[PDB]
């Protein structure tokens, strides 16, 4: 049809349209199945520029492998829409869709309409969600519980000597900035990375770290007690909005105009100096000025004669981290200066690392915006750690915002598999084939874990399914012996919202794919 109207068209009719979507779905899963569990292998990614990126997370991998397909673009966008909401479950998303399309093809190839399978997915999706509500366990979410949840999501993206160090820095940071009410607000934990020393020196600083210091060589480098003045006023020489211009005379009137144009900016400096001299009469306290706008070299010479350590051009986000930490007020004008608008720190010292300068704010009274300091000897090591830190922070915020936690280790995928079998006869018609095919796709998480540890794929499932019929215990798969182990009494925990979103997402995409009739490309070759 279309080939008669547009000769330069590419079409795929009848079952050639289903053979392209199935083939590519299984192609992305044979590469993404080696990343599952703490026993997955690391991958090397090299771009055209020549940089090196070692990643294990399914979202970073999918957006870095050179892949040009229409139907491989739909799965890529589903994983992105999970990383920015839940932050976990990007590898398990591709595996289930790739396998759910594989099982549904065994019945379509036997002369069966794809719509009959579709009705089976809807019934199986409603039973699976009603089964998950009774498996979750509601707890208080004390410190000891959040250690176990955070460790499960950090032991798969680093080694054991690092996850034990990064777990304490993530659990502590969330607790320090959480109030008794209101949702946990992110964007208040600055992630600073310095390329020095080893990777085991990644610590948590109760304060703020700024990537710039003082620009005068006559300013203090260590203050033991200081008032923090956070301001967003301009101390640079500025010009009138309307076009002006001096019109002077004999050379004496030129000198009367050069120092008459600096009065407006030297008045702002003289308001700070009197405020400093009032609250600090004796040379025993400091006075640190943090600005969001620039400062002239002239104003860095007036402030440095009184020991006013001043920093210029801070980021806009730090006008909110510095009020929660210290306790001042971030003001825009100087017409209402008062001692009530000043912060308080306990130690401000400067750190110089080669050609870059860092400033530390420590010993705050009641800090509410902590910072994380990342250290590592390689550029790609600081990116590998920064991915795990993001993963571990969204695994703790999810565990607090939802008062329930689901056990892991694959002990829950086996549980929907047994529940849906006894629900198969209750569905009338040929739609029982949808429920049987759905119960087979959910069993890929135990299969991949059993296969990545070096066991038998079939002999392990029969052992896991030998339990859970004779004892109502959520038994998972061990990753060192292959024996059935109970996941609720060891420490393996997942998130209730991660598993809930995954079931919702993996069914909607694989239902629209199975109903695609043809792949038509009749438009313009390129927008030109």
């Amino acid at each position: 049809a279309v080939k008669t109207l547009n000769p330069k068209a590419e079409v795929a009719r009848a079952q050639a349209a289903l053979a392209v979507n199935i083939s590519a779905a299984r192609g992305l899963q044979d590469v993404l199945r080696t990343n599952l569990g703490p026993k997955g292998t690391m991958k090397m990614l090299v771009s055209g520029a020549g940089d090196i990126k070692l990643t294990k997370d399914g979202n970073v991998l999918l957006h870095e492998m050179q892949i040009q397909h229409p139907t491989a673009s739909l799965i890529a966008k589903v994983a992105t829409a999970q990383d920015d909401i839940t932050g976990d479950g990007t590898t398990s998303n591709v595996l289930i869709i790739g396998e759910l399309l594989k099982q549904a093809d065994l019945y379509i190839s036997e002369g069966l309409h794809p719509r009959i399978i579709t009705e089976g997915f809807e019934a199986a999706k409603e039973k699976a969600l009603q089964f998950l509500e009774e498996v979750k366990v509601s707890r208080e979410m004390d410190r000891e519980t959040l250690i176990d949840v955070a460790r499960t999501s950090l032991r798969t993206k680093v080694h054991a000597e690092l996850a034990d160090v990064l777990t304490e820095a993530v659990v502590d940071s969330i607790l320090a900035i959480k109030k008794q009410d209101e949702p946990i607000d992110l964007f208040m934990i600055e992630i600073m990375e310095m390329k020095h020393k080893s990777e085991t020196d990644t610590s948590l600083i109760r304060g703020l770290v700024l990537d710039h210091g003082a620009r005068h060589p006559d300013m203090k480098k260590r203050v033991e007690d200081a008032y923090i003045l956070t301001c967003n006023v301009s101390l640079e020489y500025e010009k009138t909005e309307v076009n002006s211009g001096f019109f002077y005379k004999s050379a004496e009137e030129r000198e009367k105009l050069v120092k008459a144009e600096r009065k407006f900016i030297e008045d702002r400096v003289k308001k700070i100096i009197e405020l400093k001299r009032k609250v600090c009469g004796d040379s025993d306290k400091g006075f640190v000025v943090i600005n969001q706008k620039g400062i002239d070299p002239f104003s860095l010479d007036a402030l440095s004669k009184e020991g006013i350590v001043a920093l210029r051009r801070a980021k806009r986000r730090n006008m909110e981290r510095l009020t929660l930490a210290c306790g001042g007020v971030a003001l825009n004008s100087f017409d209402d200066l008062s001692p009530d608008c000043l912060g308080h720190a306990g130690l401000v010292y400067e750190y110089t690392l080669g050609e870059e300068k860092f400033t530390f704010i420590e010993k705050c009274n009641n800090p509410r915006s902590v910072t994380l300091l990342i250290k590592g000897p390689n550029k790609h090591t600081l990116t590998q750690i920064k991915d795990a830190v993001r993963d571990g922070l969204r695994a703790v915020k999810n565990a607090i915002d939802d008062g329930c936690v689901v056990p892991g280790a694959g002990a829950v995928e086996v549980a929907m598999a047994e529940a849906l079998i006894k629900h198969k006869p209750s569905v009338k018609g040929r739609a029982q084939l949808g429920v049987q095919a759905f119960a087979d796709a959910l069993l890929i998480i135990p299969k991949v874990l059993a296969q990545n540890s070096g066991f038998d794929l079939q002999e392990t499932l029969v052992k896991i399914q030998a339990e859970h019929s004779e004892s109502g215990q959520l038994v998972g798969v061990d990753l060192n012996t292959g024996e059935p182990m109970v996941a609720a009494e060891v420490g393996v925990w997942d998130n209730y919202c991660v598993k809930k979103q995954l079931l919702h997402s993996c069914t909607v995409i694989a239902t629209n794919i199975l109903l695609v009739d043809e792949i038509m490309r009749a438009g313009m070759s390129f927008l030109k």
Partner: protein, 529 residues
Amino acid sequence: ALHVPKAPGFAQMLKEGAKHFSGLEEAVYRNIQACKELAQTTRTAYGPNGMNKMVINHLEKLFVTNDAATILRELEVQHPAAKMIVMASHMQEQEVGDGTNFVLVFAGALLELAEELLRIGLSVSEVIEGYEIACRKAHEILPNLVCCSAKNLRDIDEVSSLLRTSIMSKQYGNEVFLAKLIAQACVSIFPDSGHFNVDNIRVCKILGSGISSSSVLHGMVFKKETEGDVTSVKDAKIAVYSCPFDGMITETKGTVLIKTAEELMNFSKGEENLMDAQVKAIADTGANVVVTGGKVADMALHYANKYNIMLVRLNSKWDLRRLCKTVGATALPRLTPPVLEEMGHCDSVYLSEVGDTQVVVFKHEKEDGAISTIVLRGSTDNLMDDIERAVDDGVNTFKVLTRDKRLVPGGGATEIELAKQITSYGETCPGLEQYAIKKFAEAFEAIPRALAENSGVKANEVISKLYAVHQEGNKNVGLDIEAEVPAVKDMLEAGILDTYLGKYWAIKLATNAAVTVLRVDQIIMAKPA
């Protein structure tokens, strides 16, 4: 004939020009080959008997150097697996400063020895676990081998014998003269608090007679002439300015406005008489030398010569700030006379010619200054650069001795003794990991092998002789160099010692770069562009 098609799946969806290397026979065994080639290029430049290398970059600039890090910097590398070994060496240069070749030799022997273990059955995870266990053991044995720590860092007779090992490893033959120059300059700028700074030592290169004509000078020197007419002052008061030496103009667009004939005649005379008072105001404070950092004016130069003042211009910003520390002055952002604390006192400022180059010298008679410079002279532009780096190794050794004064016997007496203790530890571990710990100990023999091959003696007899003496208990026995036959010699008595912190960071960074390459399984490369 027939053609083999493409396998369905990921291979059919790759972009053109990209490559995919997955498996153990295609990714791990090929990564070790690339890293083994890198170790054979920089090994020839190891020890006193190392050889130089002629490297030419793509700007047709020539490098004759013996540093391991400098060779890797001017060589382009297109292998990803060999690029991590380079970045592992560049990290030790910024932390310690010496020991860049140790990482290449060690990471080259750990990786090669792991290939043999992977064919006898051992898995990759068993090799990684075995190496880390051995790495921790070496960090406990190492402190027990420390001998002869530093006594006094302010004595010119003791510090000179501690930097000699660093220099002799790069300029053999001139290690006695060169060690007396760095030691004479580091102790002069050493403060009482003990906070040593590396940027306070300056090196200037003047094409001249020879290396033996080089000398140290407490002060600063410049490759510039004098703007004015006065070219020698005995006891000067330097007044440093940051603003240019001319009349002050407004930043907004300003213009004069002459409306009467009488104001037109007086305008030119008004500006000149205004400038006379400003220059005379500074001249009354005793400021014989004025140093600026901007543009000098023609009218301002006239009055400078009238009052016997010296005018020097330095348009380099940071070079101006270094002068403020040397003389003890402050930069004035405004053209106003300094009062009491902004006047730097020197001992002699004069313009002299050194090897057809007119230079300005801020000489000091006192030894307690802030910045000290070292004048280097040679016959070839290449010879002076090679000695520039050798000086920097000596300075960086002084900084490490400030932090940690502990020293270990060098010349191979540390690696062999570390090989005996690690080998015995692995014998007591029953399991699959005892094969990996033993291979870790055999990698420490690659360093004495590199010293024996470069000297011109049979290496196998050296390790044979070293192992027998150390078993008796002599842990201070290394390798003799002056001996034609492969003999041995005591190192504590001879005086060849290395820094404890230099080797502590060398092993940690070498093992880290070797275990990351083994963890890689699949490599997905994009189209080069």
